Design a protein around this ligand. Sequence first.
Ligand SMILES: Nc1nc2c(ncn2[C@@H]2O[C@H](COP(=O)(O)OP(=O)(O)O)[C@@H](O)[C@H]2O)c(=O)[nH]1
Ligand SMILES: Nc1nc2c(ncn2[C@@H]2O[C@H](COP(=O)(O)OP(=O)(O)O)[C@@H](O)[C@H]2O)c(=O)[nH]1
Ligand code: ALF
Ligand code: ALF
Ligand SMILES: [Ca+2]
Ligand SMILES: [Mg+2]
Ligand SMILES: [Mg+2]
Ligand code: NA
Ligand code: NA
Lengths: 342, 333
Amino acid sequence: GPMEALIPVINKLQDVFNTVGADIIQLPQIVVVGTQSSGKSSVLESLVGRDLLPRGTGIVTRRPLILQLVHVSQEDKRVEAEEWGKFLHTKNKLYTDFDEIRQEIENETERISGNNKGVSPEPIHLKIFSPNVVNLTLVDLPGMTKVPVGDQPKDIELQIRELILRFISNPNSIILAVTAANTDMATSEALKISREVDPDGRRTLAVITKLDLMDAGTDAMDVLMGRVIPVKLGIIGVVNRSQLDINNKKSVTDSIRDEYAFLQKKYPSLANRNGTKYLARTLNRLLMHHIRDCLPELKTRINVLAAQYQSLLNRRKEAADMLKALQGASQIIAEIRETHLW
Amino acid sequence: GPMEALIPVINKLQDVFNTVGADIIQLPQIVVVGTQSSGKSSVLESLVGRDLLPRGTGIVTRRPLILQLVHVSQEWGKFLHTKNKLYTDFDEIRQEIENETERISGNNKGVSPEPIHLKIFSPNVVNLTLVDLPGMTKVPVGDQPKDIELQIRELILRFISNPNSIILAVTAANTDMATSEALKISREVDPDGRRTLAVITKLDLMDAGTDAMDVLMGRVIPVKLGIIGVVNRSQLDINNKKSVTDSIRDEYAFLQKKYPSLANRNGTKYLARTLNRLLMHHIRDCLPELKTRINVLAAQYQSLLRRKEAADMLKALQGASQIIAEIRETHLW
Ligand SMILES: Nc1nc2c(ncn2[C@@H]2O[C@H](COP(=O)(O)OP(=O)(O)O)[C@@H](O)[C@H]2O)c(=O)[nH]1
Ligand SMILES: Nc1nc2c(ncn2[C@@H]2O[C@H](COP(=O)(O)OP(=O)(O)O)[C@@H](O)[C@H]2O)c(=O)[nH]1
Ligand code: ALF
Ligand code: ALF
Ligand SMILES: [Ca+2]
Ligand SMILES: [Mg+2]
Ligand SMILES: [Mg+2]
Ligand code: NA
Ligand code: NA
């Protein structure tokens, strides 16, 4: 997938966490928000590079999905033969087929929410274990709506909007504000709701999907250049698979190749600052910023333990080994600080 | 244009009101509502068949336009603000809507509730008021204040809360029908759908592997009076000055190709016919009052027994009664 760059850094963090006995630095949750069918699940799964989320027109995502990516060491390690999933609701059942993971999301949605468009705020909890992922929580959410359909109650719009707000009001979250390119940017429900919790735009990244669907005689140049609504952290255009492409089983590799080609053809002057890989790179920088910000806390915690183990060292071997491990941890922090991504 | 069918009906309705000496009723205003750039101005002007309304992506309509079609007794425009100047050039009318919008709303995306008043005089129109409105929005841009969304929404409500209005609830086909701001707001003022007609624009822009069949068959959101799909000009087509005739031809062809089983109940001509039927319903509702008025004057003139005048009016009242019956029996297409 496109978000592997941080793996060596988080491996170093894990060494420090193992010594200090706590996972002291937690990366912000990445949460997708926007109007129904704006392409949110398509964006969120593109950061995984595996097709694990149900997608489609009409309402598809109908419960929150808390997707916890869990990095797996070479010790705990097992193509598709290296990665697996577990749901809380299916206990210790292991899923190796990502199509089956997708189907189980649909299954578990239907169990709680019914089969006629109903929505539930109860999250589905999924862990994906892989040597190719960092420790990161991605949150998929139903899109905003206007008119109740199927089983939905009269106040469905507010139910969804309040559900979204509960997730994005978390200060340690990055908001992917998703708006479709075939709508005017000023109509972005994603940007409206993001500004309610993040008025200064410190943790909101604008994604413009469906660039390929724009009416002839129109384009997103002004949008992508920040000339309509400015978005501090970035406005990044993507081209995910059409419904036809999903029906035709078009691969992730081909989706990305066609996105790249599309941007070269229609947005050549902006192409190197757009696309799915660029979205991933931008997110990586935000995640690294959080790590750097938290290093002083981590260093302080190391020192608390170092002084404490030095005191036990007037169990005497226990203290000595820990002191050396903590010396190592202090060295690792400086290394992480001075690491810059390519 | 596609809305000429009512001409002969209103002509005889006018004859009846003249005979009774009463003011002819006002047909309900037809008001277009929906999200910004859903294609509202494109829909509204298609009822006239002349290209008089500024259209485009981003915010274009920034003031209400009260477009009064005026039937000319045996085509030209007049704006209330340019007094007696008569416009025969419809591109110039369109440009003047843009100019007048800038005069009041400024040149940086601001919106004003002050209406532009335009009359279009034609022998091929019925006396009808069409109201064009800015679309609903979410994030302020340019000069717009923080509460621009509420300002636009309350502006729309000021128009459609009028019980004597028909609401054209416009939703783009390349959005999910459940996200229709037009239908949400319509249901607020017209909860039982007695005066809301749903238009689905931009069928041609739907993602490959998707279509509007379920939407157009009432299987997503039911809309009592109808859900009618249309294909208006793309921005490219507008830039290239593609004609109304060509737009309509291609819309017809698109519906035959992609919606053959539904084509006869969709498209701009069918939208016009559906609106004509709704307007006829309103006309029929005015007739009982007219009937009672004739009967009052009849017994009034029959008591009078100067003489030729009373004998003529007694026959003219009989004629008016007959015309009322005819109006009730008239089929429109
Ligand atoms: N053509 C095109 N279709 C897209 C794009 N992104 C999403 N879609 C389609 O949009 C529909 C909704 O996508 P989905 O991810 O389920 O939207 P969500 O409801 O916001 O989670 C599906 O039919 C997708 O195939 C895009 O960039 N281009
Ligand atoms: N392809 C296509 N474009 C349309 C259609 N209807 C409107 N448009 C385009 O949509 C944009 C907005 O149209 P407009 O009537 O100004 O929208 P309004 O803001 O709701 O009044 C313009 O660029 C039109 O060319 C349609 O049926 N098909
Ligand atoms: F399936 Al959606 F917003 F329509 F996630
Ligand atoms: F020009 Al609009 F809604 F964007 F009428
Ligand atoms: Ca080392
Ligand atoms: Mg989704
Ligand atoms: Mg308009
Ligand atoms: Na959807
Ligand atoms: Na517009």
